[PDB]
Write a protein that holds these residues in place. Structure first.
Motif, PDB file in Angstrom:
ATOM      1  N   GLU D 102       0.839  -1.194   0.000  1.00 29.95           N
ATOM      2  CA  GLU D 102       0.000   0.000   0.000  1.00 29.95           C
ATOM      3  C   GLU D 102       0.876   1.247   0.000  1.00 29.95           C
ATOM      4  O   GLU D 102       1.180   1.835   1.036  1.00 29.95           O
ATOM      5  CB  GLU D 102      -0.944  -0.011   1.191  1.00 29.95           C
ATOM      6  CG  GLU D 102      -2.169   0.874   1.007  1.00 29.95           C
ATOM      7  CD  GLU D 102      -3.030   0.952   2.250  1.00 29.95           C
ATOM      8  OE1 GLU D 102      -4.216   1.320   2.128  1.00 29.95           O
ATOM      9  OE2 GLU D 102      -2.526   0.640   3.348  1.00 29.95           O
ATOM     10  N   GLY D 103       1.290   1.649  -1.197  1.00 33.06           N
ATOM     11  CA  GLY D 103       2.006   2.896  -1.344  1.00 33.06           C
ATOM     12  C   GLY D 103       3.320   2.812  -2.083  1.00 33.06           C
ATOM     13  O   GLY D 103       4.017   3.819  -2.212  1.00 33.06           O
ATOM     14  N   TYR D 135       8.122   5.603  -2.563  1.00 30.59           N
ATOM     15  CA  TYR D 135       6.787   5.710  -2.000  1.00 30.59           C
ATOM     16  C   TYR D 135       6.060   6.927  -2.546  1.00 30.59           C
ATOM     17  O   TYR D 135       6.674   7.931  -2.906  1.00 30.59           O
ATOM     18  CB  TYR D 135       6.836   5.792  -0.476  1.00 30.59           C
ATOM     19  CG  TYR D 135       6.740   4.453   0.204  1.00 30.59           C
ATOM     20  CD1 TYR D 135       5.529   3.991   0.685  1.00 30.59           C
ATOM     21  CD2 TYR D 135       7.857   3.657   0.370  1.00 30.59           C
ATOM     22  CE1 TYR D 135       5.431   2.770   1.303  1.00 30.59           C
ATOM     23  CE2 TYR D 135       7.767   2.437   0.987  1.00 30.59           C
ATOM     24  CZ  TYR D 135       6.553   2.000   1.451  1.00 30.59           C
ATOM     25  OH  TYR D 135       6.454   0.777   2.069  1.00 30.59           O
ATOM     26  N   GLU D 136       4.737   6.817  -2.607  1.00 29.14           N
ATOM     27  CA  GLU D 136       3.897   7.944  -2.981  1.00 29.14           C
ATOM     28  C   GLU D 136       3.965   9.020  -1.908  1.00 29.14           C
ATOM     29  O   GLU D 136       3.993   8.719  -0.714  1.00 29.14           O
ATOM     30  CB  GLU D 136       2.454   7.474  -3.166  1.00 29.14           C
ATOM     31  CG  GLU D 136       1.403   8.499  -3.647  1.00 29.14           C
ATOM     32  CD  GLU D 136       1.531   8.985  -5.097  1.00 29.14           C
ATOM     33  OE1 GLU D 136       0.468   9.155  -5.727  1.00 29.14           O
ATOM     34  OE2 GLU D 136       2.641   9.234  -5.612  1.00 29.14           O
ATOM     35  N   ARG D 137       4.012  10.279  -2.334  1.00 26.57           N
ATOM     36  CA  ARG D 137       4.218  11.362  -1.386  1.00 26.57           C
ATOM     37  C   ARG D 137       2.956  11.635  -0.580  1.00 26.57           C
ATOM     38  O   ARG D 137       1.848  11.246  -0.952  1.00 26.57           O
ATOM     39  CB  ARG D 137       4.675  12.637  -2.085  1.00 26.57           C
ATOM     40  CG  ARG D 137       3.616  13.348  -2.867  1.00 26.57           C
ATOM     41  CD  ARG D 137       4.173  14.639  -3.416  1.00 26.57           C
ATOM     42  NE  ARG D 137       5.514  14.457  -3.958  1.00 26.57           N
ATOM     43  CZ  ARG D 137       6.569  15.179  -3.600  1.00 26.57           C
ATOM     44  NH1 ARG D 137       6.442  16.138  -2.697  1.00 26.57           N
ATOM     45  NH2 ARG D 137       7.750  14.945  -4.149  1.00 26.57           N
ATOM     46  N   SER D 139       2.871  10.402   2.468  1.00 24.13           N
ATOM     47  CA  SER D 139       2.880   9.214   3.294  1.00 24.13           C
ATOM     48  C   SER D 139       3.953   9.309   4.374  1.00 24.13           C
ATOM     49  O   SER D 139       5.019   9.887   4.151  1.00 24.13           O
ATOM     50  CB  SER D 139       3.127   7.965   2.441  1.00 24.13           C
ATOM     51  OG  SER D 139       4.503   7.820   2.155  1.00 24.13           O
ATOM     52  N   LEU D 141       6.803   7.951   5.618  1.00 23.99           N
ATOM     53  CA  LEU D 141       7.779   6.949   5.199  1.00 23.99           C
ATOM     54  C   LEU D 141       8.751   6.531   6.296  1.00 23.99           C
ATOM     55  O   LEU D 141       9.672   5.761   6.012  1.00 23.99           O
ATOM     56  CB  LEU D 141       8.579   7.445   3.986  1.00 23.99           C
ATOM     57  CG  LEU D 141       9.695   8.482   4.140  1.00 23.99           C
ATOM     58  CD1 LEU D 141      10.612   8.406   2.944  1.00 23.99           C
ATOM     59  CD2 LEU D 141       9.157   9.894   4.274  1.00 23.99           C
ATOM     60  N   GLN D 144       7.062   2.965   7.825  1.00 26.02           N
ATOM     61  CA  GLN D 144       6.948   1.870   6.882  1.00 26.02           C
ATOM     62  C   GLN D 144       8.240   1.097   6.731  1.00 26.02           C
ATOM     63  O   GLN D 144       8.345   0.259   5.836  1.00 26.02           O
ATOM     64  CB  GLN D 144       6.480   2.399   5.534  1.00 26.02           C
ATOM     65  CG  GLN D 144       4.978   2.493   5.458  1.00 26.02           C
ATOM     66  CD  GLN D 144       4.519   3.748   4.779  1.00 26.02           C
ATOM     67  OE1 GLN D 144       5.329   4.586   4.402  1.00 26.02           O
ATOM     68  NE2 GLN D 144       3.210   3.897   4.627  1.00 26.02           N
ATOM     69  N   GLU D 170      10.656   9.241  -1.125  1.00 32.73           N
ATOM     70  CA  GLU D 170       9.432   9.697  -1.761  1.00 32.73           C
ATOM     71  C   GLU D 170       9.704  10.121  -3.198  1.00 32.73           C
ATOM     72  O   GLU D 170      10.845  10.366  -3.594  1.00 32.73           O
ATOM     73  CB  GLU D 170       8.826  10.856  -0.976  1.00 32.73           C
TER      74      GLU D 170
ATOM     75  N   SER E 172      -7.941   0.398  -2.183  1.00 27.78           N
ATOM     76  CA  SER E 172      -7.974   1.844  -2.355  1.00 27.78           C
ATOM     77  C   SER E 172      -9.402   2.313  -2.609  1.00 27.78           C
ATOM     78  O   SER E 172     -10.340   1.521  -2.681  1.00 27.78           O
ATOM     79  CB  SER E 172      -7.060   2.266  -3.497  1.00 27.78           C
ATOM     80  OG  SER E 172      -7.359   1.531  -4.668  1.00 27.78           O
TER      81      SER E 172
END
Lengths: 53, 43, 72, 184, 184, 184, 184
Positions: D102-103, D135-137, D139, D141, D144, D170, E172
């Motif tokens: 997830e991400g 990773y998607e920003r 988030s 980090l 994780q 990110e 999601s």
């Protein structure tokens, strides 16, 4: 003596298959070089499992 | 074993020789079932 | 000792069987070519001992005969 | 209209355009049938686009795997050439499973290789892992690290929590607007 | 209608369209017979479409399994290469049985590989499993980690509950509405 | 009518239709003779139907077995390949015998496999089993876990009552009404 | 007029109809020559019928026996394969002999397979059995478990009454009325 019979007839089965397959083919050696060492090494791998156990 | 404790150090020069040219999957196998009698059948 | 010589001739025959096939797969291809006068013992003997080292049977028999008596 | 690259691949030309479009110069992708694509740029932008070809080492080489040095069609396979083709597919399956979290957008895993423990009587040693992720920003980090470390810690026989190294970051700012044509 | 990807297949183009439609750009899947599929986007949406191709690493590679490195047609089959196909069909079957639970959409299962435990004098080590999963929205996903940890335990010889690691998550937010044409 | 999939099998199309009709979008199944089947949806349901294709991982892969990796037509079969081909037909026969119980709609059964059986001098370990099931609703599914354990216990040599884990559940709510065509 | 399944077998198509008529929808068994049967359902009964196809996992797979993995058509056979071919014929003969009792409509028997303990100095373990049955209703099925265990006990070498487990159940309610066509 069933493991003496099965091992005594897999040898005659492999002589008919292996030595008799380029009889019907020739009636090219690199493609037949890698096939024979796979079967002889696996039959010898099986006969020790039937021997020492 | 008192003066028999002299020879076990005398065979050390043969014992470092019997580990360099034998495999240690056969060295311990004749032990757990390095000794001087457990390395000659493996070397 | 009688049952030990019987078991030793049974294990000793077991080893004998693969090579026999190794012999006729040399004389078959030698009779397939025009080498009927050439003796097969100079070509069968090279592939008799690479089947024994790729299978490395010196460790397989020695470990199996110990495992028939002892235990780890 | 001065060309600078030709004969490229489909995934190679999309890596050249996305680099040039980030730096305010626009390029044209021209298909040529059997001889691949080709990228042309304008005359006031030729000096900058040659500098970014030299800087970013474009066009990209194809990505290498360890299972390509030991092809499976060979007649003789060593125990070293079988243990390396085993680990070179576990290493790809782990980085293919890291992307379904997830991400995560991209990931890369490195398994430590052991070769010279099998032929001799030396025992094997502990296996080390290493990871990278994007990773998607927006988030957190920092929290994780423990999810990737927990997932990697139970995919091998004996690893420790200080034998796993995760370095992640990110993603960059998005490029959504067009470059623009150079007027004269 | 500037092309950006072509020559893909059925499962890759349905991923590139499902990715691009999430970011408010619409694509067009064009069949080409024996030459595969093609994907075209609009000219205002071309600059952003190359950026999301580079970011999400599209088109996807086909998924790898360990059993493909040791094919069955390799007529010389080592004992080292028979347990790698026996492991690789168990980890392919446990994840097909994890998807038939109550709420699971996807799953992935990894097993520790030990192959040389039969040729050395050492006893084999324990077995380590690890699993990822994706659940439906609205599920109590905290109490559902003990059903996967109970189902996975006695499916092997002897594993503990601290040798299994389950990292699961929810899906999601759904994408239902249309992206909309770029009006000019 | 936009095209989602084409070239499917017969039972691959009945899963995609049964998934799409659960989410209020209606699909059409079109046969194309030797080239398989095809599935088309309407125009406004397209961008919502590719999302459930990506989410549910459709089309389904064929279900894998352990007996497929070891084919019976090999010239020589190892003692490992004969016991793996034995245990895969035992868990395939116990799964079909669990579906004939009173209430069970579907089931799945896993057995622990022995891999290093003869290569050690060690005797083999105990046998572990696991099972999943889906029951018709209206049934007390807490008392029906003691019949599958009694059935599975003495179907082998010696398994214990704590080496079996049964995880079962009731089925989802029934879908009986038509989706509805999108008026525009 | 809409089709669900085509290219079916005889026993497959004779079971999809028996499942659909239980849930108030009717179908047609249309023959097609040497191409096998085909089943069509009405247009208001199409959405529910795909849901019961997916739920009941239809069409039914052919039943698996253990004698199919070790075929008798081979020329040379192992003692392990001859033992596994023998126990799989006693397993079917006891099943056909259970259907001749007073009241039994169908039955299934499982035998504990032991092949690897016959070679070593360890003696073979005691053999275990397990059976299922479906009785006609109105029968007192608490007293009829004692003669199934009596028939199954001394039909083998040495079993106990604790190694035999019988799980039986009465048959369902009769389906005798016609479903009914969807009126419009």
């Amino acid at each position: 003596m069933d493991d003496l019979v099965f091992a005594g007839n897999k040898a005659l089965y492999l002589v008919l298959i292996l030595s008799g397959w380029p009889t019907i083919v020739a009636t090219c050696l690199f493609l037949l070089s890698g096939w024979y060492g796979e079967v002889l090494l696996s039959y010898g791998r099986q006969v020790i499992f039937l021997a020492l156990a | 074993s008192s003066l028999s404790k002299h020879v076990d150090e005398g065979l050390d020069g043969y014992r470092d020789y019997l580990i360099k040219y034998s495999d240690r999957e056969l060295v311990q196998f004749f032990e757990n079932a390095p000794s001087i009698f457990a390395l000659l059948p493996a070397y | 000792a009688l049952s030990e010589i019987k078991s030793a001739f049974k294990i000793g025959f077991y080893l004998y069987l693969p090579f026999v096939v190794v012999d006729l797969v040399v004389s078959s291809v030698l009779l397939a070519l025009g080498m009927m006068m050439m003796s097969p013992v100079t070509i069968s003997t090279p592939i008799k001992l690479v089947l024994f080292v790729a299978l490395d049977g010196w460790t397989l028999l020695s470990k199996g005969l110990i495992l028939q008596y002892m235990d780890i | 209209d001065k060309d600078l690259l030709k004969g490229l691949d489909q995934e190679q030309a999309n890596e050249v355009i996305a680099v040039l479009q980030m730096h305010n110069i626009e390029a044209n992708k021209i298909d040529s049938g059997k001889l691949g694509y080709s990228i042309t740029v304008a005359e006031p932008d030729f000096t900058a686009a040659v500098y970014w070809i030299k800087t970013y080492q474009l066009p990209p080489r194809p990505r290498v795997e360890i299972a390509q040095m030991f092809p499976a069609d060979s007649l003789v396979s060593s125990p070293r050439a079988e243990k390396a083709r085993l680990y070179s597919a576990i290493e790809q399956r782990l980085e293919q499973s890291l992307q379904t979290m997830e991400g995560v957008l991209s990931a890369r895993v490195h398994i430590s290789y052991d070769i010279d423990a099998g032929e001799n009587g030396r025992p094997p040693k502990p296996v080390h892992l290493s990871a990278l992720a994007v990773y998607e920003r927006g988030s957190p980090l920092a929290h994780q690290i423990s999810d990737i470390k927990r997932f990697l810690k139970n995919s091998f026989a004996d690893v420790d929590y200080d034998n796993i190294s995760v370095v992640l970051s990110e993603r960059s700012d998005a490029q959504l607007q067009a470059p623009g044509t150079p007027v004269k």
